[PDB]
Design a protein around this motif. Structure first.
Motif, mmCIF file in Angstrom:
data_model
loop_
_atom_site.group_PDB
_atom_site.id
_atom_site.type_symbol
_atom_site.label_atom_id
_atom_site.label_comp_id
_atom_site.label_asym_id
_atom_site.label_seq_id
_atom_site.Cartn_x
_atom_site.Cartn_y
_atom_site.Cartn_z
ATOM 1 N N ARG A 10 49.570 41.948 30.720
ATOM 2 C CA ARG A 10 50.704 41.269 31.318
ATOM 3 C C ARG A 10 50.309 40.113 32.242
ATOM 4 O O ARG A 10 49.552 40.319 33.200
ATOM 5 C CB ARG A 10 51.620 42.288 32.030
ATOM 6 C CG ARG A 10 53.041 41.765 32.129
ATOM 7 C CD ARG A 10 54.137 42.768 31.821
ATOM 8 N NE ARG A 10 53.818 43.860 30.896
ATOM 9 C CZ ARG A 10 54.686 44.394 30.034
ATOM 10 N NH1 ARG A 10 55.896 43.863 29.879
ATOM 11 N NH2 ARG A 10 54.336 45.434 29.289
ATOM 12 N N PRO A 11 50.837 38.894 31.985
ATOM 13 C CA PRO A 11 50.544 37.772 32.882
ATOM 14 C C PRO A 11 51.130 37.987 34.280
ATOM 15 O O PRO A 11 52.157 38.659 34.425
ATOM 16 C CB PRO A 11 51.235 36.581 32.196
ATOM 17 C CG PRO A 11 51.555 37.001 30.855
ATOM 18 C CD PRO A 11 51.730 38.479 30.889
ATOM 19 N N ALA A 12 50.491 37.415 35.313
ATOM 20 C CA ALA A 12 51.017 37.482 36.687
ATOM 21 C C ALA A 12 52.268 36.608 36.746
ATOM 22 O O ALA A 12 52.261 35.498 36.194
ATOM 23 C CB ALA A 12 49.979 36.977 37.687
ATOM 24 N N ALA A 13 53.356 37.123 37.351
ATOM 25 C CA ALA A 13 54.623 36.390 37.483
ATOM 26 C C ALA A 13 54.593 35.479 38.718
ATOM 27 O O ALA A 13 55.401 35.614 39.629
ATOM 28 C CB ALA A 13 55.799 37.350 37.529
ATOM 29 N N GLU A 14 53.626 34.559 38.726
ATOM 30 C CA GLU A 14 53.352 33.596 39.780
ATOM 31 C C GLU A 14 52.602 32.413 39.174
ATOM 32 O O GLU A 14 51.990 32.561 38.104
ATOM 33 C CB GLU A 14 52.532 34.249 40.905
ATOM 34 C CG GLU A 14 51.123 34.667 40.527
ATOM 35 C CD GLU A 14 50.417 35.392 41.653
ATOM 36 O OE1 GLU A 14 51.009 36.344 42.211
ATOM 37 O OE2 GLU A 14 49.313 34.942 42.042
ATOM 38 N N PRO A 15 52.603 31.240 39.830
ATOM 39 C CA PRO A 15 51.904 30.082 39.245
ATOM 40 C C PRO A 15 50.416 30.298 39.118
ATOM 41 O O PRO A 15 49.782 30.760 40.064
ATOM 42 C CB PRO A 15 52.222 28.932 40.186
ATOM 43 C CG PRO A 15 53.364 29.399 40.992
ATOM 44 C CD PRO A 15 53.287 30.878 41.080
ATOM 45 N N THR A 16 49.881 30.014 37.924
ATOM 46 C CA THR A 16 48.469 30.181 37.596
ATOM 47 C C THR A 16 47.979 28.983 36.761
ATOM 48 O O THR A 16 48.746 28.431 35.969
ATOM 49 C CB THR A 16 48.208 31.506 36.894
ATOM 50 O OG1 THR A 16 48.995 31.548 35.722
ATOM 51 C CG2 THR A 16 48.518 32.723 37.771
ATOM 52 N N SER A 27 61.513 33.270 31.760
ATOM 53 C CA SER A 27 62.207 34.168 32.686
ATOM 54 C C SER A 27 61.357 35.389 33.071
ATOM 55 O O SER A 27 61.698 36.091 34.025
ATOM 56 C CB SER A 27 63.628 34.527 32.226
ATOM 57 O OG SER A 27 63.770 35.400 31.121
ATOM 58 N N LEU A 28 60.182 35.542 32.456
ATOM 59 C CA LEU A 28 59.218 36.577 32.841
ATOM 60 C C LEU A 28 58.105 35.997 33.701
ATOM 61 O O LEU A 28 57.597 36.670 34.588
ATOM 62 C CB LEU A 28 58.634 37.260 31.619
ATOM 63 C CG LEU A 28 59.634 37.990 30.713
ATOM 64 C CD1 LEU A 28 58.911 38.742 29.624
ATOM 65 C CD2 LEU A 28 60.561 38.918 31.491
ATOM 66 N N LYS A 29 57.734 34.749 33.446
ATOM 67 C CA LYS A 29 56.690 34.078 34.203
ATOM 68 C C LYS A 29 57.146 33.690 35.582
ATOM 69 O O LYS A 29 56.393 33.855 36.551
ATOM 70 C CB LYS A 29 56.207 32.818 33.455
ATOM 71 C CG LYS A 29 55.044 32.086 34.128
ATOM 72 C CD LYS A 29 53.757 32.941 34.317
ATOM 73 C CE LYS A 29 52.660 32.147 34.975
ATOM 74 N NZ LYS A 29 51.451 32.967 35.151
ATOM 75 N N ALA A 30 58.349 33.091 35.657
ATOM 76 C CA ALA A 30 58.932 32.514 36.872
ATOM 77 C C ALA A 30 60.338 33.039 37.074
ATOM 78 O O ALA A 30 61.301 32.288 36.942
ATOM 79 C CB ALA A 30 58.926 31.006 36.751
ATOM 80 N N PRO A 31 60.483 34.358 37.355
ATOM 81 C CA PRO A 31 61.834 34.948 37.397
ATOM 82 C C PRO A 31 62.742 34.426 38.499
ATOM 83 O O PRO A 31 63.979 34.468 38.387
ATOM 84 C CB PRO A 31 61.552 36.445 37.526
ATOM 85 C CG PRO A 31 60.195 36.507 38.155
ATOM 86 C CD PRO A 31 59.443 35.395 37.529
#
Ligand code: HEM
Ligand code: HEM
Lengths: 722, 726
Positions: A10-16, A27-31
């Motif tokens: 699962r990718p981190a739901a924050e800027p990377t 909507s999962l990356k940057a909710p």
């Protein structure tokens, strides 16, 4: 459970940064990234976690691995409704791609004006600096299919859907300020000429073929946009580093009913930047999804694409004050004559969730205007107004395409239109006509007014006979190509010459090449002679004596037409390849990464294999990609830290990595023993070197990066075997 | 008249080599090449010369350059019906592309059997050696869109439409003898996993991404076809140099009603040949239409693609005599156990006229069989039967797709089916049902029989319960990948290791790479260790001790599974780049061109600019392309004649041309002073195997070069290429 225990699926739901995590639906990356349109799509978003697998009728599936058969080695049965639904849906997934601009990449964002423009337009979205308008933007190529490559030489589309409080406004532009043709009646001719040839459907994403140049040679109106396409404008580095233009002259209408002519502009806040041809062509092979990827990853990293909306404004009384016709879409308005006034800012800050549902199904159309805007008689725009509504009937399967979630207005919409394929809205109105008394005539007409009024066309004077005739004012084809040419830097001029030369070398019929060279002689003799020389053509005495075309309103150049004459470089969001060795000098790497982080420049750690390498101090360095897996084509600059250089000194891929980056004018930085690489790349210009990597070394590299490419390197790059 | 007075706009209507003339529609290029199908299409062919430009309603157009407006600078009028018809047609040109195999290239041809197969099948097209069956063949990739590149790493489709006297038979195969999955129910899962990922629609024409390898790691049945895809089989040199397979076991039915199991094969008469990965990937960028172009140009040159149809035949009583299930499409039948019997020859000898009308609109479907053939319970085939009819309803806009000219049978067709979108046939039958008395029951049913009989299914025994269950006989996943692996040459094995390594390096989630490496350890430890090393993964002690899978009915290898183990090279139709200089030694060039021509090898004369150069004897040499315009990727070998070598010695593009060709294992020949180029590719003074060199381009020089070309690539050079920066 099939997911790894460590949660690394699962990718981190924050800027990377690019490559740090797997990419994900917006909507999962940057909710927490929201706007009115993104929120209004929540009614149709479907999750998945903790839900049972079902048919489309809601029936839970027990075994999604097998068909129903008479015995475990038997025939499949017709009563397997689960199999047939699954296969039927699959069998019918595809829809027709767009006739043109089939290849495109899109994102969600918002727009806000800097100040009220109430004085010049009653358009609600431009009425107040506190008024935020959600947008959906699609960038595209023109010729290629939806499965074609990104970094082709072509014009780029730049389409913006503004979800206004008074209606959808679609600003459907391109990355050049003019088009190839004057009248919409010729659009199918032009497009057929540039598209793959009919007999064999070759070539894909390329104008370098006989029919294109045949049409160009016979239709000199095309020459202006051809000049832009042959320039580095035709091969942008990123959708974030190109200009946008509405092309046509439109109108702004204020509350008092005053019309002002306007041409729309988008200024990239990341600056203007393009690839070089060899790099672009090789990138179509190494990464055909380069631009789509770069856009998605910039948004995931927080390097949001930003553009400034600008207007060139011309009073109605100034319609005839130029050497060219304002209604001619093959003519640009030089910024030296009419400046671009800053209007507002657009930020693209969220990717879609599902490419098909949101990008593929999006419908943009220049006829989608709002009160406060209007059209002109530009004969290309006039025909566009018919086309977009029309094409969407078959592409999107019916007249209810506005009901596809991405296309839906966020403002109210009520009328007497009914039925049609895939009708979503269930109208409760007792009446489906007006005038009606049975519903007290609702929904009702609204008179035009200063705000929240009905649409009324500007009462433009019409006088003339019914004619299919081109205005004589449109019959000038060489002055704008010449203005453009003279505004380019010497290296930009060389790249134009090379663009024409490469393209015409792929034209089988020599007479077509000769005819194009004749057209070039009408633009500029230096240009024509340089292209002719590369084609083994000699200009005739008549060709040598063609009088150059007139200046454009006394201008012999306009620097705003060059990508690079006026530096506007920005390093944030660019990427550097760091070429590792099996015993990296950790001190060099610390200094490198710290300096890059401070400027928002990303890094990709490369090696001859995947996995990890250990530095001189025991630091474990994870490898992002191999030298072959992530070629120099995909980065902006290359850094080679010190360490065990002997590990990579004889590596063909490492050496070639630097030779390719060198050829393509990219900054290269070599620390300590990495300077041994200078010899293998035959050496010069834009090579940073020092005993160690530090403040000075990194400052020099970042200064080169702000300049984009090392143009001074061009004179002897022809000789390098790469 | 806009055409040049010299007529140089029009191609010669005779065979010409690639690049000699512009390419053209098939009926204009080769008007004398004919077959029953091509002739039957004449009713729909539309010409153009000497005709007036009209609307679709037949109204002549006076001004096709302008819209109708109120004044010359006025608004366009809604009454301009000419503009609206033209724009409407344009606006609606596109149709949905095929869900899979969207990228494809096609040609017309014919098939003929070697002898009557009446003993094993009653199929009319196989009944008589003098019975010629027209064919239409489409080759394709699988994953990519219709606008994607040709030389991707993928499986290739090989679809043949046979226009038989007893109906259309479509042999819808691939270039590998197995498929990735066992049951059709999983097809959307597999295809969705390989296709561009749903959030962002990346990557195009590539399986090198997380979802593909996630599915593979979780579905070991996929490993056999994955092995083929990772091998050089995944990157063919040309559609002319790959094998074809039906994959499934089908049945042949004779007049007596005897069933024989069969698997279909296509043998390329030009031999098997593939690219190398770096070359293939770069070719996707430099010429994404490489295969489509090569096919079209080979046909225009008279280098007709030829294939031999072959059958693997298994008696009904031998159904269970193998270590694998005959009905399992992830299993191949080793030729060492069941040989391929030669059946007939197919020749592709004419290109289409209009790609959209003939190629894009062509509909192939494996359920299109004829009396003398039948299906089996292969659960992948079983589901395919549903899919093809279904998809054609939306792709081709309705149930009348058989009326689209390319799809039409050449034999009679009559039934009680009526209406449907774009109905062409006007039925005069008073009856649209049967049984009927009003038309004396015509058209009538026909009993099954030896010839010209009605279709009847073979009365296969069915015994079992209605189950969604995989046969336990299908639950073996490693023996066939191992048999394939062991059948490869050492260089083919290296290329497989490199294929997996490259692909897994593009998988973001490391655990997926680790899971795939674990699967490889169940196939062969050498393979698994080599891939693991490239990924910086260490195999565990448990992984090192996995027992290898069993042999396939006592076979450890089968050389028929290798592209190169058994030489089958053919140089006809190959192409050589000749690097010119401004004063070419004409004697060298005469010898070179004559030798190439005699063996049917094409040449492309390259220089630093277009136009012409003059040789030492005044011969004017026309330039086909520049060194940058036609890179080494597009040719099979490179020859550098003598002359003024100083002209090109310092040309970066000329030097790189040789470095690229060298890395890609291509034969290189250098005459006279051209030997100065040996320094660019680090060849010792004493020379090297695979580099032809001499004082001149004499008798021995060309023979040595052509011998190297028959071997395709210089495999012995592989250890030397790593040092070259290219
Ligand atoms: C200034 C000249 C033009 C520009 C800037 C332009 C730009 C674009 C762009 C950017 C798109 C794709 C938008 C998207 O769906 O993401 C597009 C689509 C299209 N354009 Fe234009 N266009 C031009 C002229 C024309 C003309 C003259 C016609 C026909 C008269 C035309 C017909 C179409 C059609 C039918 C499509 C596909 C529309 C759709 O299916 O959504 N365009 N154009
Ligand atoms: C055993 C391996 C398979 C083979 C060899 C095979 C081969 C092919 C080939 C060559 C084509 C391209 C034909 C053309 O040019 O039109 C094709 C198209 C297609 N295949 Fe398959 N296929 C296989 C399995 C499957 C399965 C399980 C399905 C789903 C039931 C499937 C569904 C399709 C569809 C829906 C298309 C495009 C539909 C169309 O022709 O319009 N295939 N296949």
């Amino acid at each position: 459970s099939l997911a790894p225990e460590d949660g690394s699926h699962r990718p981190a739901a924050e800027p990377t940064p690019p490559g740090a995590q797997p990419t994900a639906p917006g909507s999962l990356k940057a909710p927490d990234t929201r706007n009115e349109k993104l929120n209004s799509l929540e009614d149709v978003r479907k999750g998945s976690e903790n839900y049972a697998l079902t048919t489309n009728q809601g029936v839970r599936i027990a075994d999604d691995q097998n068909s129903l058969r008479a015995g475990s080695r038997g025939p499949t049965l017709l009563e397997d409704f689960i199999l047939r639904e699954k296969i039927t849906h699959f069998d019918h997934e595809r829809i027709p791609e767009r006739i043109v601009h089939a290849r495109g990449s899109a994102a969600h964002g918002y727009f806000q004006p800097y100040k009220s423009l109430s004085d010049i337009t009653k358009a609600d979205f431009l009425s107040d600096p506190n008024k935020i308008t959600p947008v959906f933007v699609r960038f595209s190529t023109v010729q290629g299919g939806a499965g074609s490559a990104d970094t082709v030489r072509d014009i780029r589309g730049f389409a913006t859907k503004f979800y206004t409080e008074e209606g959808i406004f679609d600003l459907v532009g391109n990355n050049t300020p003019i088009f190839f043709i004057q009248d919409a009646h010729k659009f199918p001719d032009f497009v057929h000429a540039v598209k793959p040839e009919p007999h064999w459907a070759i070539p894909q994403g390329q104008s370098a073929h006989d029919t294109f140049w045949d049409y160009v040679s016979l239709q000199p109106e095309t020459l202006h946009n051809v000049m832009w396409a042959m320039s580095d404008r035709g091969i942008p580095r990123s959708y974030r580093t190109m200009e946008g233009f509405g092309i046509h002259t439109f109108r702004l209408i204020n509350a008092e009913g005053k019309a002002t002519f306007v041409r729309f502009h988008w200024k990239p806040l990341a600056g203007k930047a393009s690839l070089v041809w060899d790099e672009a062509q090789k990138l179509t092979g190494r990464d055909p999804d380069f631009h789509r990827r770069e856009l998605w990853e910039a948004i995931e990293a927080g390097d949001f694409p930003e553009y400034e909306l600008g207007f060139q404004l011309i009073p109605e009384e100034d319609e005839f004050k130029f050497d060219f016709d304002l209604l001619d879409p093959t003519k640009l308005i030089p910024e030296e004559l009419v400046p671009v006034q800053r209007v507002g800012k657009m930020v693209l800050n969220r990717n879609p969730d599902n490419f098909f549902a949101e990008n593929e199904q999006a419908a943009f159309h220049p006829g989608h205007i709002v009160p406060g805007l209007d059209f002109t008689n530009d004969p290309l725009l006039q025909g566009r107004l018919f086309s977009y509504t029309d094409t969407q009937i078959s592409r999107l399967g019916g007249p209810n395409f506005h009901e596809i979630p991405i296309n839906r207005p966020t403002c109210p919409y009520h009328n007497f239109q009914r039925d049609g394929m895939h009708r979503m809205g269930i109208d409760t109105n007792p009446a489906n006509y007006e005038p009606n008394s049975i519903n007290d005539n609702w929904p009702r007409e609204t008179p035009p007014g200063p705000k929240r009024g009905g649409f009324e066309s500007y009462q433009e004077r019409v006088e003339g006979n019914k004619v299919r005739e081109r205005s004589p004012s449109f019959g000038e084809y060489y002055s704008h190509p010449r203005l453009f040419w003279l505004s380019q830097t010497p290296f930009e001029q060389r790249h134009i010459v090379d663009g024409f030369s490469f393209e015409l070398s792929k034209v089988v019929r020599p007479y077509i090449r000769e005819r194009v060279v004749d057209q070039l002689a009408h633009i500029d003799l230096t240009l024509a002679q340089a292209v002719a020389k590369n084609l083994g053509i000699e200009l005739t005495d008549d060709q040598l004596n063609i009088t150059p075309p007139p200046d454009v309103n006394g201008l012999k150049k306009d620097p705003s037409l060059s990508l690079y004459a006026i530096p506007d470089g920005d390093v944030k969001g660019r990427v550097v390849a760091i070429l590792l060795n099996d015993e990296v000098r950790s001190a060099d790497l610390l200094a490198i990464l710290k300096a890059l982080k401070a400027k928002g420049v990303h890094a990709k750690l490369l090696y001859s294999r995947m996995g990890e390498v250990t530095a001189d101090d025991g630091t474990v360095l994870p490898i992002a990609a191999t030298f072959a897996g992530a070629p120099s084509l995909t980065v902006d600059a290359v850094i080679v830290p010190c360490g065990n250089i002997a590990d990579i000194a004889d590596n063909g891929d490492a050496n070639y990595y630097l030779m390719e980056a060198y050829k393509h004018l990219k900054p290269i930085a070599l620390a300590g023993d990495a300077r041994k690489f200078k010899a293998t790349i035959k050496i010069e210009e834009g090579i940073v070197e020092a005993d160690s990597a530090d403040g000075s070394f990194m400052d020099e590299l970042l200064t080169l990066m702000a300049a984009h490419r090392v143009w001074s390197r061009i004179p002897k790059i022809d000789k390098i075997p790469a």
